[PDB]
Every structure is written in C-alpha cells, then in structure tokens.
Amino acid sequence: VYDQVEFDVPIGSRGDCYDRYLCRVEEMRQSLRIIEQCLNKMPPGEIKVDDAKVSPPKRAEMKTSMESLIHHFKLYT
Amino acid sequence: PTTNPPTARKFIWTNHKFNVSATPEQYVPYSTTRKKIHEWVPPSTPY
C-alpha cells in the first residue's frame, strides 16, 4: 500500500553531498508523515494470507485439525 | 514475582546458577548417543 498513503518525494536540485544529505533528512520527515497515516488507518483483519498452502497454519488449528497439522508439517519440512 | 508467583512443576530448579564457564561446573560438550557399530571381540580362549 504506497498507493493509499500520501508523501512528497524530496527531490534535491544540484547533487552536491549536501543536497543529498538534505534529501535524506527530508525523507525521515516524509516517513513520519507516512507512519502517521499508517497508525491512523490500519485495518482490522488477519496478518497472513489464509491459504495454508503458502502461510503456516495457526498454532491452535494445527493442534486440533488434521488438515492443519499436515499443512504445518509439509510447509516447515 | 512476589505479587504473582510463578508456576512450580516439581522439576524446576530451586538453586539457579550464574555463568559457570570459568568455574569447573561448565558444560563440556559430549555426544549422548551410544555406540553404533559394535565389534567382534576376539575369543579369549586360545584355540
């Protein structure tokens, strides 16, 4: 999501090691603007895709459902 | 730990130790597996 957060790229003008420093200091400031948006707009939801084939099954599920233990065993091994 | 004491499980240590590395109590690594290829010991009785 860098399409749903708003920031300004700090383009420098001339290229001396100062303009590059100033750009790096601005990106720290612009990142605080992006961090602000992320805390303000973080959605309720799951943190990993729900396909057991790609992301490992949850600890409770692998210890109670056979399809999850098989998926945990195969994914880790 | 005083306020909410921990769970005791009748194996956990009562005297916990600090780094024993310079002192003789130190872990000395060793293989814990038993022998694998047992050998034919020669007959002790002269033929």
Add this chain to the structure above:
Amino acid sequence: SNLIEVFVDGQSVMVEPGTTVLQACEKVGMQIPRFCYHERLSVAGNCRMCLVEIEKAPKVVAACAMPVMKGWNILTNSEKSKKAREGVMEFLLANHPLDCPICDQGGECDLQDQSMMFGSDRSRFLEGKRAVEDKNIGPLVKTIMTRCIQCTRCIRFASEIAGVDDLGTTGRGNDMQVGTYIEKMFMSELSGNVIDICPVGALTSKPYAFTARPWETRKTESIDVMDAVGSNIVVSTRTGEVMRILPRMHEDINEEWISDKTRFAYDGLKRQRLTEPMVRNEKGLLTYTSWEDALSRVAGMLQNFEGNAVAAIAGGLVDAEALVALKDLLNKVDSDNLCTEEIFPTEGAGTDLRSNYLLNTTIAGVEEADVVLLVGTNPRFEAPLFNARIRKSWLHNDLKVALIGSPVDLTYRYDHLGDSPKILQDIASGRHSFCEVLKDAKKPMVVLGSSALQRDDGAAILVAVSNMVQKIRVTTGVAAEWKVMNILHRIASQVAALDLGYKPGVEAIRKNPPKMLFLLGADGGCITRQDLPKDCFIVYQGHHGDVGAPMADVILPGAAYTEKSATYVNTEGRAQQTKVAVTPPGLAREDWKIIRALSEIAGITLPYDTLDQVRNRLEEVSPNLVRYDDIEETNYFQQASELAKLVNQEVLADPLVPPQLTIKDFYMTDSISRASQTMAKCVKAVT
C-alpha cells in the same frame, strides 16, 4: 488394430482396449491422485479419491477402475474433479488421528501430499474422531492402525502377491478395522512389503521405528546380496550408518518387492563386525595390530608355501572383484585350489558353458512358462522373490507347478510328484503321470535347486535331470530360445565364482590339505582346523566374526555390500553393481585392495591398482562381469547333455530335502543375517 483413441484433455492418446481411465492419464503424463490402487495389486475402488470427469457425462468416473472408451475426454483438472478430491480428502482426514510427528511415514505419506497438493487447506470436522485398538501383528511391522484409511491394499498384497490370505476386513461402518480377527502374527517372507505398500503410516517397521525421518536419508541405489535373486534395493543412509533398505523397482528381478531377510538384517550389519586386523599372539589370542604387520604375517607364509599348499575357501557374500584378486594371487604362487563352499556338480562340463549353472529362462520367463518342475528346493525360502514369480504366474497366468522334493508350504497349489531323486528317472522313462502333462506343455521349465546338488549324489541328480530335460525338449518340440533346464542358487557369490573359473566344492582341498588357507569371507564349516594340516595356518578375509574368525591365525577385516562398489551376479547371470552407501568401518578395507596389497607385500603383485582396472581384469576372464543389467541369451545345452550322458552315477533313494523346511530355517543363514538382533527376535517369535 486394438488401439482406441481417447483424449486426455484433448491429447488424443491411443490405448489398447482395456486400459483404465487412470492408465490413460499416465501415458499423457498426468497422475490421478490415488489410494488403494497399486500397479501390481488388483483394482478395488475403495478410496474413490481418483474420481475424474469424462466429458459430457453426468457423474464423475472412477479412474482406476473404468475401462476407457472411445472418444472420452478425461477433464482431470476440471473444477468438478477438484471438488471430487477437495471433498474426499475432507473425509479421509476427518477420522484421521493427527500424530504426523509420530507417524514415521512423515515425509513418506501419500496422504499429506495428496492433501497438500490436491486437497483443501482447512477442516470442518468439528465432531469427534474414532480410535481403533492397535494390534501386535508381528515383530517387524508396527501396526498403529488408528491410522488406516481402509484402502485394502494390505488385504490384497497379503493375498495376491504373497499367499498368506490372513489379513482381512472385520465389521462394517466406520469401525471396519483391517486387522487379523484373532491375534495370529503375519508370519511370512515378503511380510515387510506391507510397510512399503500401506501409504498411510498405520503399520510401519518396528526396528526402523523412530531412528530417522525421510528428508534426511541419503539414498544410494545398490544390490541385494542376502539371496541369489539379486533383488534391486535402495540403502537409505543418514550421517554414515545405514538406517533402512527398501526396494527399488527392477521389472525382471524384484518388481518393487524385497525379502524379509534383506531389509531387517541391515541391523545385523552393525555388530560382531570386524574392523581392525588382529593377528594370533604368542599367548594364543587374536591381538589387534596394524595392517603392515598383519599383511606380512600372511605374505611371509605365502612366500614360504608353494602351489597346492595354499588354498582359498571363499563363499557367501564375497564380490566378483575380490574373487578375481584372490585367484590372480594364488595362481602367482601356482595353486588353482581356489574353491567355493556350495558344491555344484562339476564332472560334466560344469563351469565351462555357463548354462549348466544358471536359471537361463529369465526370472521374467516364469511368467511365460506352462509347467514348472521344481526339483529339490523350497523357493519360498531359497529365492523368495522367485517364489513370488511362480506365485503371480500361477494366479494371473496358468502355470502348472510340480515339486519333486519334500511336500512343503509353497504359497501355491503344486503337484507333489514325490520325495525321491529316482522318480526323476520315472518321468524320463515316461512312466510317471506328469510325463504327459509336460508332453502337453508348449513352454516347460525344470528348476534344480542348488541345495539338492549339495548332497552326495548331486552329480547324479544333475545328470538325471538333464536326461529328462532332453526328451521333454524332444517330445514338446519346444523352440530353441525357450530353455527348459535352469538351476537356481541360494548364495550370492556362487554364479560369479563359477564364472571366474573358481571350481565349486571343497572336495579338492579335502583330498590334499593346504598348509595355508585364505578363507575369503567363509563362515561355513566346509573345512575345520582339526581337518587342516598340523600348521593350520589360515587367515580370515571377511566382515563379521562368526565361525572362521576364532579359528584364524590372521584377521584381515573387509567390507560388506553396503560399503564397496563391487559386482555381484544373480542366477541367470545378470551382473549388477553395489554402490558405496557408507564408507567401510574402522581400519577395515575393500576386499579387492586387501588382496592387491598382500600381493605387493609378497612380490607377485596383481596388475590392477584402481577398481576400474580390477574390472577390466574381470572382462578378460569373463564377459558378464563388465556388462551390467544384461542377461546372456545363447547357451549350449546340447553339448552339455552329451557329457551328462557320458557321466554314470547313482541317485541314492534318500529323499532330496531343502534345508530351509519352515520359515525359522530361513531367517538366519548368512553372516549378516546371523548377526541380526532383528532376525534373532524373529527367530524366537517363531520358536
């Protein structure tokens, strides 16, 4: 002709009429997820995990059991055929106990993978599971049968590949448990295959219970040396000790199966094993010493002794490469008293034509035979994967089996002509009833076991059989490439030894006692030290201290077939190469080098210094040794008979009896077998 064209997703494959839908997908290359269907086991349809969708058809069809029909398109990956698998896998898993970190068929599961590949990611079985009481089916197979997916491949194998017919289904509903109704152990050779054939880890191997996990196991493809069928096998080694030996498929020799002996006697390979070269001390006990000292003990005696005072009694599991290195050495001191423990009659042409001593009708020729005349051997316990051959060809084809031996359990219906070597003469005369049966056979085969030959009238028994094969051939008018006479061995290093011109039997050593004897892996009692001359200077060349070690002035430890790139050859002369799965233990060394080195310490120094050279050597003395996997087609039976006719001998009335009368006889035979704790546990279970 006979080539329907069926489309597997529009690929227009063409198949013989009769091919199943699963088989049609295989030739295109697609693989229907399958349980309960094994190529060499009958189709049962129990799992229904293979449901596919022929085009324009209301219901999905059972791949493994549906004769394909013209035009059909399989739609194997159709949305439907995936719901037909996403919903079956739901069921197999629902009653399954999730102890995958107990199930030692962890990575060797055709049910997790077929679930990780063809099934769903979750479960909806919020209800409770079932549990089935376990069974002590035996001391080799651990049946944690709460794992069973009721796929009935065991009940098939236990009836179709092996003739046990014991395992069976008991009950109906969700508590159908596939275990012996009364607790009777599944005691039979071919027993351990159930492990390999149950895709679930319900019943698995008890010795290899929890020693490893398959991803770790490094897999080296080698050859079975315990029996003379020379079954192909894969030795699974982890961090340098063998963990398991499981079959690898050879269409002609062992087609996916291996004997109970050659997969649970890998444990015997790890104890009582010689490693350092001990020598007899002044005190009279074997003292471990460096090679240099042990080798010159032997070399000095060798230089002192002339020809016919030095002899070698090889035998058992020694490879062809050592056998030529021991002959080349003893000829360089001119004794050609090299011999093997198993006596093959050698008064007529023996060892000279290569058909007197081979099963030249191939292991795969038992499938196209018509009548088999088993004479004096128990195939069940002398060549278990050849007994199976006659098992399959008596079931799927129609072999008429006849045994002239002891009436013995043969896992099939044989005709017991009698227990007398002279009744062989009865058939030759045409007097006995089965004489016509053969007359009626267009492709017959006689099989004379080596153990019948090991009796005193073995020369006469071979001659008597050759006469009958002669007129059987004349009366049937069988074609030349069909070969009626063949003899099966039960010692791995016997066909190779006879090939290199080793003369069978210790009869020659018996008549003149050698001052020196190289026992190259001989644990047999063919000669003993009381029998030897006063000096009795003999040096054991082998891997396990059993009978030859404690009566040995020198111990030169060698290796075993898991530990060297040697060559072996089974009974119809197919030479095969063992590969080094594990480096040999201790100071122990490869058999061929010990003898090349002893020669260099002696001054007759064998010309070969690298294996490839020892092989080139094998090529000059014999052809089969260098060409691997290649049976030698032509043979010269006609001239063999002429010399048989010259030989006159009496077949004594004593019935010819196989030494392995019942299965306890079978479990412990060779050195590695004898040294097996698993075999020992099996022996006491029988007793």
Add this chain to the structure above:
Amino acid sequence: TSVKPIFSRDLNEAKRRVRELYRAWYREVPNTVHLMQLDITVKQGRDKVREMFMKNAHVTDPRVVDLLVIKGKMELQETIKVWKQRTHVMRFFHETETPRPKDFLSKFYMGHDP
C-alpha cells in the same frame, strides 16, 4: 566442431600469447619475492611458474588456451599490482599442507577411499 574463436584463431597464435605471459611471470618472480619479503628463492619460484605453465601443457584447443592466459594475466596483475599479499602467493607453494603419497600400498594403509 565449428567453434567461434575467442581471441586466438589457432593453437599457433595462441601459443604466442603464452610465451608472452611466461616472460611476464619470469620477469616478475624476482620482484615479488622482494616486495613481499617472501621466504623463497627466485629460482625456486621461477620453477613454480614453469610448473603451472605446464600443468596445463596438455590443452590442445585454441579457445581454452586463450582463456587460460586471460586468467593468467589477471593473476599476474594481482601480484605485480600488489593486491595479493604473501599469504596469497605462498599458497601456490602449498607449504603447510602435508603431501599425500600416491603409492597404492601407501593409500591402502591410510584411507578408506583412494
């Protein structure tokens, strides 16, 4: 057959280049033994150069030879433009490692797999 030429059209032209490199190394051995304070003899080193230049005497193909000198030239550059310090150079002499016998009896006495 039908190969494209890397830099040398034929073993002949290629050999020319090898000659040049040999000379280069020959002229350089002394300098290195002094700029690196190596404890070796110029003569000794120069023989080593010969050793290497012949270790690959068997190559018959022109393309393989050409790469061999490219690589050879690169090594020289690392030793004359000094980026390779003594540890690097002396390694050529295999000074610390214990030599292994090639006699069969010798190997038999020591290693499982020769």
Add this chain to the structure above:
Amino acid sequence: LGLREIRVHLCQRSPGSQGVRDFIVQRYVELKKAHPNLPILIRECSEVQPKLWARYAFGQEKTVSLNNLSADEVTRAMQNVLS
C-alpha cells in the same frame, strides 16, 4: 608349459565369431572328453573380436585372436595351446 585354463571369449551373433561358435558346436564336447579335467571356459564377450585366452602355470596368461578364423583353424589353434 603347464596349461591351467583356456578361455574362449566368443562373441554371440558376431560375424567373425561364426567360426568360433561353430567349433563349440561341433568339437567342444570332444575336446573336453579328451581333456576331462582342464577347465575350458566358453564365455560371451560383446563388441570385441573372439580371444582364446590361455592361462599357463604360475599366473602367466597368453592371447590368441580368433577374429574371422575358420572352424578348423579354431580347432588347430586350440590344439596348439594344449601341446
């Protein structure tokens, strides 16, 4: 020259070996009957011309090529070997 063994490494279905195999078919039995102890080995090479290997006493082996040789030349060569 002590003769210990003779190896006739014929090659089946090979043009040259025809003579060798013919010898085996017609005279092998006879030779054996005559020398009933000596081990005469009939072996089958491939993609190699036939060789009558002979092992003399004290580990010396000698070679006589039988490539494209007639049945009696094979018989004569064999007879020359066990002098």
Add this chain to the structure above:
Amino acid sequence: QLITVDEKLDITTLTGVPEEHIKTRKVRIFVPARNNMQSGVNNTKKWKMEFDTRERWENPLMGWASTADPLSNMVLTFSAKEDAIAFAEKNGWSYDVEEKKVPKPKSKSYGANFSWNK
C-alpha cells in the same frame, strides 16, 4: 570466421577443481527411483548425475558426522541422458550411465477379480 576443433570440449583446466577430485571421482548418471513408501512419480522424471560417496567419520567432540569430500552433497540435475553425458566429458569426471527403467505396462480390469475360475 569460425575455427575447427575436434577436441572434445574438455575444460577441466578452467573449472578450477583440485587435481585429486577430477581423476579419482566417478559420477553415476541415473534417473532416481521412487522410494517405495510413496506412489508418486514426480521424482522419477529428471536424470541426475551424482558423484561417488566418500568418508563420513564420526567427530570426536560432538559425534556429528564429518566429511572430507567436497563434491559429496552435489547432485546436478540434467533433463536428458545426452546432456548429462556431455557434462561429464567436458568436466573430465568419469561416468557410468544407467538406462532409465520405467514400469512396464500392466493390464488391469476390475472384472477379473470376479472370475469364474482364476
């Protein structure tokens, strides 16, 4: 213009392998069989060439397996027998190819199991 060479590409001189492991190492080109445990055949498809196995002595301090052979764990995968043979020739390793052995066609039909006389 191209030049002609009949010399089998041998590039043993460029690969950078120690002399001992180019002249004493035999590699086998084989198609892997299937552990009988599983019935899947997706690991019996591509040819692999594997170098000969070497010493695996036990380590004294921890008992871990220890190996002195560098080319041990290396198994290269080649799609066809011809290509794998080529790799051995130009790299100079000795080769001993094993022909692929594929299961022979087997005739099966559910009707048979209910045969009047089998």
Add this chain to the structure above:
Amino acid sequence: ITHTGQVYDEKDYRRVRFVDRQKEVNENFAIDLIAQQPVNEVEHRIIACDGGGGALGHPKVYINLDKETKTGTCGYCGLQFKQ
C-alpha cells in the same frame, strides 16, 4: 549415566574433557518422571489427550482404551489412561 546410558568407557579419552570439569547431566529423567503420574481411569472408550492446556499443549489425539488388559498412552505426553 545420562538418559540414554551414555557413559564414556573407562578408556575413552573424551573423558579428558570432563577432567577438571562437570559432565552436564540432569537428575530429573523423563522415563521415570512419567511413571509417577498415575493411570487416568476414564469412563469412555475413547478419550482425548489435548496435551494439557489446549493450544499450549500437544496436538490433540484420541486414544482407544478398549483393550481391557492394557492402558492407552498418549504418543505425546506418555500419560496413561484406562477405562
């Protein structure tokens, strides 16, 4: 000594390692500690051992306590249950 009877022989030199040092071993051995726990007398043919603590325990498994003679033992805890 250790859980598996790992005891360096009287002549092995790894014993030098233990010279002037403690060979680390644990007095609490599992083979024994599980024994102490008594057999659980459940009253249902099949019971489940979730491992104690559910998600904080071991994968759930059902044990068949039908065999009257023996007692079911969780392949995980080792806990035994009898009907």
Add this chain to the structure above:
Amino acid sequence: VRPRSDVTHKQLSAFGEYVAEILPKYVQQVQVSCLDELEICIHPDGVIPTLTFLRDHTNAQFKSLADLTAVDVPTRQNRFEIVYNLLSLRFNSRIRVKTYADELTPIDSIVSVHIAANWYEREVWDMFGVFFFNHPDLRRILTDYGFEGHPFRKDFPLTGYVELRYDDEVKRVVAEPVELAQEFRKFDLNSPWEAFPA
C-alpha cells in the same frame, strides 16, 4: 489471489512486438510473463545492438541497467543465461533482455551502452566464468585474490575446496583442503506428487 491488470499484459505485449520488429536480426523470442513482465530474448551477437536501441530510442527509452545476472542451467548446451533487466524512467516500465553464453564463448560487453555494467560484468565473470570482450578492466571482484574456480556455477561445491586457518609454524594464514566438522545435511525435499498441469 493477486490482482492482475491486463492493461499491462497488453501494453507490454505490444511493445514486445515493436522491439522484435525493429530488431528482428537478433530477437529470438519475446514473452510476457503472467506477472506482466516482458523478456525479449536475443542472440548473443545482439547484445550491443538490442541494448543500444532500448537505451536510445524515443519510443523506448530504457536508461538505467537494474541488473546483469547469469543463471546457470547445466543441462542447457549454452550453460549461462545472461539476463539484463532495464528500467525506463520515462515510460515507467522494465524489460528484460536475456541471451545465452557457454563457458568459453564470450559475450560482448555493454559497458559502452551502460557504464553500470562495468561492475556487474566483473561479478558475472568472477562467479560464473562468462567472459566479456571489450571490457575495460575485467577482474575478480567478489572472490578472494587467489580463488580458483567460479563459485556460483551449479557444479561448484558449496563449501568449496579450500578453507583458511592460521598456522604457527609458518606464522601465516594457510589454505588447506576443506575438512568440515558437520557436512551440510542435504535434505531431499522434492515431493513425488505434482501440483498442476504447468
């Protein structure tokens, strides 16, 4: 399931045809992955020409070289597969031009077309052994000064053949043949069951 826009698979596809048409003497295959990435494939001789057209064409300006790499398919006669990934800051698109080079059949160098390649080409020589003609200064970059062998080749042992330790006798670091105290455990991981037709 990832969101896929076919706008790109169409735009990029068309461009592929455009490049191919403009440079037919070298373009052998031009494909767009299902991941919306173009991958013109060129004969090794077209290294200079195809790149230059992309660096300096108004309708396809591909100014910077993202990367130069060489996969090694040992089976493939031409072992290496030099892959050049380029970016067009003007058209916000990347393309990959991949060629094939065998061990002793060198590729041309593009240091002229992009000087970024001065280092990556040295990296490809050091790791894989491909040689680049007309390179200003080709010499090992990542490997040790005396290293023998090209490391990322699939035929090179991971642990390698030499390791370093300090020897007192000689008071200097010294190579010795590698002796490992726990060999790399080579877990076999491939499952015997396929996933889909692909």
